[PDB]
């Protein structure tokens, strides 16, 4: 006798996230080479509702990808299968080791909060480097933004 | 002016997201018709007297006139016939707008000299100055006909017999008798100040204007936000846009300039503003006569009739002799493109209706190419001034809107209400 | 007197008193097949609506005669005009009855045989019978002292998750809960006063709302004295009553008190009896609706505030111009203990009957009725502007959007008198011939109905909280108006009988009517009963009872009062939450009037033909009733919607057929019957087929009963059930898939509304068991009600607050609606694609608001609902115990009613038994945050002398 | 339909 | 039977009444008699 | 110039009166005791609107008017209990003393 809101296929893995991208440089890995900061990017279902896919979308604030990773929702893994179309402007994406891992990280006012990490690579790269997006999810207190 | 961003009554207006079924107008409607023109009906049942009559049938052509303007059909011909006919059909615009034209010609030309006997709130029995609220519809409707290329070579030569003939009326034409009490109100102030809360913000487009023009009128119906001191107007249905980019905590009534209600309380209904008047005579003189000094003469006995309305009498200065002014225009294009503009001025917190139709009728201010999250992004893209389509638009075929939805009421129990069309579809003088 | 020809249920007093009830129809809700009966709301004192066979007027009298003694009795109804803004109901004619003076209630479902009643005995007659004086042993002193509580029954089921704040961000100062996720930590609250703030834990409150109600409490005490001899008898009774409902504060009351004596002496051939009644009443409503009012208020709480921390004033933080949240609602303690709104009311109805035996076989009768009442009306706002907006946040720091723009204060009284009179002159003749029996009356009835009141309003307070017609400095509103309508009508009653048989009855009856066209008054209606008890004449003594029953026949009936001519009103025009009457400035003026009358309308004619059975078996252990009925309501007067540009908004005209047909069927059996223990079953269902045959179509076939203006609305539309809801929805593809704004995510607006659902069950049933064991009496009742749909506003206000747990969807993550596609239109190539763009947290709070991925049709709530309706524990005393004492009987009661309710899935949010718009039609509209339905409980001590 | 009705504050 | 109902409902609780409540009352006082009745006879005796 | 005005006022009054006697002859004498409560409530109220100037000069409504209208509006109420002894006494039907 408790109503259960619901969901879509993937929620607890869709969300708002604060991420800043590091690389792997001459194989050690350099804090945000591009010194863009803590950036937002937004993860959510497909208009298909499945299990098996989530969309991945930077909102224009790194790169301009946006693609459909391939998600094992009991695992909260997702990756690609090689490169994948970017549907924002014409290019391919490679994500590689995506976790999302619950209250696994902290909030700048040191609370726990769900992690995301995913590794990155991009078919016009030209120095064709294989980068790493961590953050967390957004809470909504603005102590928490940047 | 938008939707202030900490209420809602008005996001489907904004966003152009409303439907025939959300009857935007079906109270007007009601009241157009089953109150103003049935009384009319009676009132020519009733009296004998031309002068009456005259002032009755102009009464009448002016609700019939709004109706078209804003559904382009209207009943007409076969309406207020009661049980006789309740489902009356739906003549089109054009031959509602030569049929009243006709009412108000005939009505004219039955006058006799004898006196208004009847209470007069508009005039009080100055059949001298019905005339002239009779020719001032005359030339909107003429100069309607024009732009929608219908008969233009004629109605060109009547609308400057009309000019030269300077018979129009003095002032405004307004119903000025509001008290500041309950059910004795400004229809508008009463139910967006009394009725419901603040819902109105400034626009961007009126804000950018008069700031860029250095307008002392800026003050009057605006107030300088509370966050910083200035005059910041929104984006046409970007409320919910400016939370989304700004976050909810700058993007507060706090943040945006509130349409000042407190003088509206006992303020005038307009039908015809004297700056409207002068304003379309200018336009008459700068283009169909080529009479320069006259136009001139009319755009700014316009600027300064706006000007002591508001209470500013004295500083037309600013922008008569400051730069948007008549000779820092050199094509005659630019020029009417100045009378245009500061018509669109002198007709906010006056007479909306009029500044609506008059918009689409010229067509400037003109539609921005740049859309709402462009000029959000950098605003030197933007000419301060021109309309911008809102940011969200439920208009499947974007831009701005055109008219106005059927009334529900008509839909429901009249069989022969013609078909709903999407508010992008425009009315039948509106041809670009 | 079975005899009867159609349907009826009879009960006895001693089963209507047993629940205890203020009023004395609410106890049958559920019980009788055939007769639907629901309470507007658990407020103290409010109407009851009744309405037998389904509606069949279409506005908006559909409640039976209610018939005393028998003399019409008023039964008018006063509850808000506007229940958007401040509804309340302050209770139903019916109400005034005291329940311990009920002898025998039969109910009469049949329009076919009505010449007795006349025209609104076409909605059936509720045929009271109160207690006679009586010989028996020994004073003749019965007493009745009640105690009862009330608690909250089913508040809306909520979001635990996020608290304060909008658009998924912290706010300090919101109405709703569109926060963040809750964390536990330190965070600030509230408006902040004299350079100081509240902070504290983000975690929520998950009974802040429940905590709130207090419980409900209501004594009652009843006496009654009676006495008889061979020649008279006298019945003096006094009833009190005294509500104060489980919301906070004496704004939940309700008192009532009666006082009656009947008297009855014989004196050979003769007989005079008089019944004169008086009733007193006091309510005190807490005022529904979308503005200031308590419920609005309180529903639009974060999740993290404590309620019950606001109460008191000398917190300055509770201070109205500091109210944590100024988004048009205020403290819900401050609107309670400073809004005023009452109503009082004294009545005195009774009754007159001489009865005149002569020749042996005639009767002459003379019963002549009046009902006259006065009622006074209070309602007052204090001057919130005054009061609190220079100085604080709330407040001038809101400027034009503050909760007290333009709360200038208000203040009115109403004073309202009603009077009918009702005569009878009857002759009756009764003779046996050989095994045949004839039984023949013929009648006069006169009546006369009239209703005025007095209306006086000033709006800004001078002082503000003083709510007197002197404390303004504006032009006060005064209101007047009367009516007045009478009926004469002669009728006649022939009722063969053959050797307990065979019984065929005729009747026939012509009303003269003020209220239809001079023209045309005269309405002839007639009706044939039969009945046929077979098993008297059929052995075995297993078929206790046997009895078949026919019915055909019609009622007639006459307008509402002056639709005949064309008015001319005051001229005012009602624009968007407001109004522009005259006089203005000086002037008065005269607008013709929106509703054109019809000097060509004819009566109404209700047409009915009815079967039924009615078996018993095993010394009455097994017994059923069942009635097949088919009734059509043809030609009734209405003001049927227009289009406004013909110059009138309505047109009085006859309408089409309304009909009704449907199965009333009645099982009762007791499996178990010892010395000292019998346990009875009893299965009632009724099924109703509702459908509008035509409205006439030269003005369209649809005309609205209620609705918003662009929101939900319902109708009566030619082919379809009576009150069948339009409501907003989603557009959709060809293919079923839901259309998406390209942008914003949130689902497009089709072209038109669709339709959503009709007001009425498919069917109702209730079950119910009695078991005795030794003077212990043990009740259990349900009341099963499925189908049909109303509008929910507590759902609507939850949804947007993002109280409802429906809105912790996707946990609140950005979502793309499933199936989900964008259109893509190029000037007349419409083609669809999928949809990737996903709705924002930004914006979760708007997909919600407007109802989801229904729309408006999200807050169309199924109608359905199982109850535990009334359980009644009784303990009669054994004699014995009673022998040293004064006292002839006693008992002690335990009972419970509006116990328990189960819904459907969809619906966590409401109790289906409320309404704002009254207790007839307009009240299926729905709901509008009207207060939450109560649980009631209590003892009953019953005393005899 | 008729009668108004109010949005609210967020 | 509560006994302690002697304020009088009829007029406000003499805490609300306030100076500003008052003063507009003197000058209408003033010149009811002095453009009245007074202003009256007055006119007499000045024989306008 | 016209008027029209319409009064509606209310009365209601409640009295109880809760007595014992007692009455006994004893010898020639006769006593007769009676002692009581009194209790009472008298209320009356009314509500007054009156118009001037009949916009149409022989109908008599409070809509018929362009000016303003008049109201006003009364209520008082009383309460009162009271105790009380009658005590008469009576010798041999000739003398009789009331106290
Ligand atoms: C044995 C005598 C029978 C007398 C029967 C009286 C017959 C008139 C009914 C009548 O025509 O119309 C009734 C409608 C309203 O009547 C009233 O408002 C009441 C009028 C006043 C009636 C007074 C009746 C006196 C009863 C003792
Ligand atoms: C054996 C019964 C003795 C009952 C004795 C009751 C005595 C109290 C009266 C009282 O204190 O003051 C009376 C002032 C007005 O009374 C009312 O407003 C009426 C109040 C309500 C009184 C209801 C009385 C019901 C009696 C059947
Ligand atoms: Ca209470
Ligand atoms: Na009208």
Redesign the pocket.
């Known amino acids: 006798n408790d109503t259960e809101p619901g969901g879509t296929a993937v929620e607890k893995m869709a969300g708002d996230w604060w991420v800043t991208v590091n690389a792997f440089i001459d194989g050690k890995e350099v804090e945000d080479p591009f010194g863009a900061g803590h950036l937002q990017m937004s993860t959510y279902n497909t208009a298909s509702n499945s299990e098996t896919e989530m969309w991945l979308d930077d909102l224009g604030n790194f790169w301009e990808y946006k693609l459909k990773v391939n998600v094992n929702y009991a695992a909260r893994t997702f990756s690609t299968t090689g490169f994948v179309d970017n549907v924002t402007y014409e290019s391919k994406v490679k994500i590689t080791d995506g976790k999302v891992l619950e209250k696994a990280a902290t909030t700048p006012s040191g609370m726990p909060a769900d992690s995301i990490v995913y590794m990155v690579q991009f078919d016009d790269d030209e120095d064709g480097l294989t980068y790493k997006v961590s953050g967390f999810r957004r809470t909504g207190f603005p102590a928490d933004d940047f | 002016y938008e939707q202030k961003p900490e209420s809602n009554q008005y996001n489907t207006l904004c966003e152009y997201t409303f439907t025939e079924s959300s009857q935007q107008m079906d109270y007007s409607y009601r009241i157009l018709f089953a109150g103003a023109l049935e009384d009319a009906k009676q009132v020519l049942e009733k009296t004998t007297n031309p002068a009456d009559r005259f002032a009755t049938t102009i009464l009448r052509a002016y609700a019939f006139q709004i109706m078209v303007d804003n559904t382009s059909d209207s009943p007409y011909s076969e309406a207020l016939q009661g049980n006789a006919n309740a489902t009356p059909k739906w003549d089109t615009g054009e031959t509602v707008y030569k049929g009243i034209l006709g009412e108000i010609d005939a009505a004219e030309a039955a006058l006799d000299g004898s006196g208004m006997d009847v209470p007069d709130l508009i005039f009080n029995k100055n059949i001298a100055q019905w005339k002239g609220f009779a020719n001032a519809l005359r030339l909107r409707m003429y100069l309607r006909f024009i732009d929608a290329n219908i008969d233009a070579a004629s109605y060109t030569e009547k609308v400057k017999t009309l000019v030269q003939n300077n018979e129009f009326f003095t002032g405004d034409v307004k119903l000025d008798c509001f008290l500041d009490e309950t059910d004795k109100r400004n229809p508008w102030y009463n139910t967006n100040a009394v009725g419901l809360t603040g819902n109105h913000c400034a626009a961007y487009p009126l804000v950018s204007y008069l700031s860029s023009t250095g307008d002392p009128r800026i003050a009057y119906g605006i107030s300088k936000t509370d966050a910083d001191g200035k005059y910041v107007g929104q984006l046409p249905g970007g409320k919910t846009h400016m939370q989304s980019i700004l976050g909810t905590d700058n993007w507060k009534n706090k943040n945006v300039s509130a349409i000042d209600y407190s003088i509206g309380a006992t303020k005038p209904v307009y039908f015809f503003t004297q700056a409207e008047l002068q304003f379309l005579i200018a336009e008459v003189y700068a283009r169909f006569h080529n009479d320069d000094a006259n136009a001139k003469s009319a755009y700014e006995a316009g600027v300064t009739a706006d000007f002591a309305v508001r209470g500013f009498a004295g500083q037309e200065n600013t922008i008569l002799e400051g730069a948007c002014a008549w000779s820092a225009a050199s094509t005659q294009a630019d020029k009417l493109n100045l009378i245009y503009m500061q018509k669109w001025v002198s007709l906010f917190y006056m007479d909306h209706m009029e500044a609506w139709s008059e918009i689409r009728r010229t067509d400037c201010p003109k539609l921005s190419s740049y859309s709402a999250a462009q000029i959000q992004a950098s605003e030197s893209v933007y000419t301060p001034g021109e309309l911008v389509a809102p940011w969200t638009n439920g208009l499947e075929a974007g831009g701005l809107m055109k008219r106005m939805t059927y009334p529900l009421s008509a839909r429901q129990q009249n069989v022969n209400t013609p078909a709903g069309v999407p508010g992008s579809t425009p009315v039948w003088w509106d041809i670009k | 007197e079975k005899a009867l020809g159609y349907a009826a249920t009879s009960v006895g007093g001693e089963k209507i008193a047993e629940s205890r009830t203020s009023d004395v129809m609410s106890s049958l809700a559920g019980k009788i097949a055939g007769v639907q009966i629901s309470s507007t709301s658990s407020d103290p004192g409010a109407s009851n609506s009744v309405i037998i066979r389904g509606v069949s007027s279409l506005s908006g009298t559909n409640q039976p005669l209610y018939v005393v003694d028998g003399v019409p009795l008023n039964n008018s109804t006063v509850y808000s005009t506007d229940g958007l803004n401040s509804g309340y109901d302050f209770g139903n004619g019916a109400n005034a009855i005291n329940p311990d003076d009920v002898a025998n209630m039969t109910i009469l479902k049949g329009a076919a045989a009505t010449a007795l009643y006349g025209s609104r005995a076409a909605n059936g007659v509720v045929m009271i019978t109160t207690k006679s004086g009586r010989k028996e042993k020994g004073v003749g002193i019965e007493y009745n002292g009640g105690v009862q509580w009330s608690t909250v029954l089913r508040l809306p089921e909520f979001q635990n998750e996020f608290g304060m704040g909008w658009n998924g961000n912290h706010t300090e100062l919101e109405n709703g809960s569109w926060g963040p996720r809750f964390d536990g930590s330190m965070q600030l609250w509230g408006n902040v006063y004299n350079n100081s703030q509240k902070l504290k834990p983000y975690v929520a409150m998950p009974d802040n709302i429940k905590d709130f109600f207090d419980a409900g409490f209501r004594y009652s ?1 009843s ?1 009654s004295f009676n006495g008889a001899t061979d020649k008279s008898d006298y019945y003096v009774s ?1 009833s ?1 009553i005294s509500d104060d409902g489980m919301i906070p504060t004496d704004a939940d009351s309700y008192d009532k ?1 009666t ?1 009656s004596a009947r008297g009855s002496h014989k004196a050979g051939a003769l007989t005079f009896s008089s019944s004169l009644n008086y009733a007193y009443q006091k309510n005190n409503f807490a005022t529904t609706g979308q503005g200031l009012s308590m419920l609005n208020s309180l529903y639009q709480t974060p999740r993290d505030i404590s309620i019950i921390g606001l109460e008191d004033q000398n917190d300055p933080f509770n201070t109205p111009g500091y109210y944590y949240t100024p988004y048009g609602v205020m403290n819900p303690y401050y609107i309670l203990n400073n809004y005023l709104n009452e109503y009082e009311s004294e009545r005195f109805y009774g009754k007159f009957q001489l009865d005149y035996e002569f020749l042996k076989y005639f009767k002459f009768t003379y019963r002549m009725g009046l009902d006259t009442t006065t009622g006074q009306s209070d309602k007052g706002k204090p001057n919130l502007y005054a009061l609190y907006y220079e100085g604080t946040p709330n407040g001038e720091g809101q400027g034009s959007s503050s909760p007290f723009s333009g709360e200038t204060g208000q203040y009115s009284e109403q004073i309202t008198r009603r009077r009918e009179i009702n005569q009878d002159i009857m002759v009756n003749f009764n003779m046996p011939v050989n095994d045949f029996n004839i039984n023949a009356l013929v009648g006069f009835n006169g009546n006369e109905r009239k209703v005025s009141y007095q209306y006086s309003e000033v709006n800004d307070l001078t002082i503000p909280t003083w709510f007197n017609l002197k404390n303004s400095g504006k032009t006060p509103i005064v209101e007047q108006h009367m009516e007045l309508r009478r009926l004469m009508g002669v009728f006649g009653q022939f009722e063969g009988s053959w050797k307990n048989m065979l019984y065929l009855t005729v009747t026939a009856r012509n009303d003269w009517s003020s209220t239809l066209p001079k023209e045309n008054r005269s309405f002839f209606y007639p009706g044939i009963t039969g009945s046929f008890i077979f098993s008297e004449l059929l052995l075995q003594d297993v078929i206790t009872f046997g009895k078949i029953r026919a019915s055909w026949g019609k009622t007639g009936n006459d307008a509402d009062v002056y639709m005949v001519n064309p008015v001319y009103a005051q001229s005012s025009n009602r624009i968007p939450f407001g109004s522009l009457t005259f006089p203005l400035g000086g002037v008065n003026a005269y607008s013709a009037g929106n509703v054109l009358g019809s000097n060509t309308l004819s009566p109404e004619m209700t047409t009915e033909s009815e079967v039924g059975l009615n078996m018993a078996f095993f010394k009455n252990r097994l017994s059923f009733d069942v009635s097949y009925y088919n009734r059509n309501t043809d030609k009734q007067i209405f003001s049927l919607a227009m289009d406004p540009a013909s110059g009138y908004t309505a047109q009085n005209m006859n309408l089409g057929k309304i009909r009704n047909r449907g199965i009333e069927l009645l099982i009762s059996g007791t499996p178990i019957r010892t010395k000292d223990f019998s346990w009875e079953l009893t299965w009632n269902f009724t099924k109703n087929w509702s459908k509008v045959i035509s409205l006439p179509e030269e003005l369209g076939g649809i005309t609205t009963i209620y609705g918003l203006n662009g929101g939900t609305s319902m109708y009566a539309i030619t082919g379809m059930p009576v009150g069948v809801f339009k409501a907003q929805v989603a557009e959709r593809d060809p293919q079923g898939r839901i259309v998406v704004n390209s942008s914003t995510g949130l689902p497009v607006e089709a072209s038109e509304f669709g339709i959503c659902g009709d007001m009425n069950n498919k069917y109702q049933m209730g079950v119910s068991t009695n078991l005795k064991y030794k003077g212990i009496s043990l009740g259990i009742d349900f009341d099963i009600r499925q189908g049909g749909v109303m509008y929910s506003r507590t759902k609507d206000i939850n949804y947007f607050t993002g109280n409802a747990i429906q809105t912790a969807y996707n946990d609140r993550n950005p979502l793309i609606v499933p199936n989900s596609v964008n259109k893509i239109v190029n000037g007349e190539n419409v083609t669809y694609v999928e949809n990737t763009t996903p709705i924002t947290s930004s914006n979760i709070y708007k997909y919600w608001g407007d109802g989801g991925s229904d729309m408006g049709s999200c807050f169309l709530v199924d109608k359905s609902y199982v109850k535990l309706r009334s359980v009644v524990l009784g303990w009669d005393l054994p004699k014995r115990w009673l022998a040293k004492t004064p006292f002839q009987a006693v008992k002690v009661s335990a009972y419970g009613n509006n116990l328990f309710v189960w819904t459907p899935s969809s619906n966590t949010f409401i109790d289906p038994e409320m309404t704002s718009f009254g207790n007839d039609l307009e009240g299926n509209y729905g709901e509008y945050t009207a207060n939450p339905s109560s649980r009631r409980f209590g003892f009953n001590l019953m005393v005899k002398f | 339909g008729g009668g108004g009705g109010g949005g609210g504050g967020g | ?1 509560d006994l302690n109902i002697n304020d009088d409902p009829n007029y406000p609780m003499n805490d609300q009444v306030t100076a500003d409540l008052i003063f507009p009352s003197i000058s209408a006082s003033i010149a009811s008699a002095v453009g009245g009745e007074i202003y009256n006879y007055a006119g007499f005796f000045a024989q306008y």
């Open positions: 005490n006496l006094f009190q008190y006082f | 039977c």
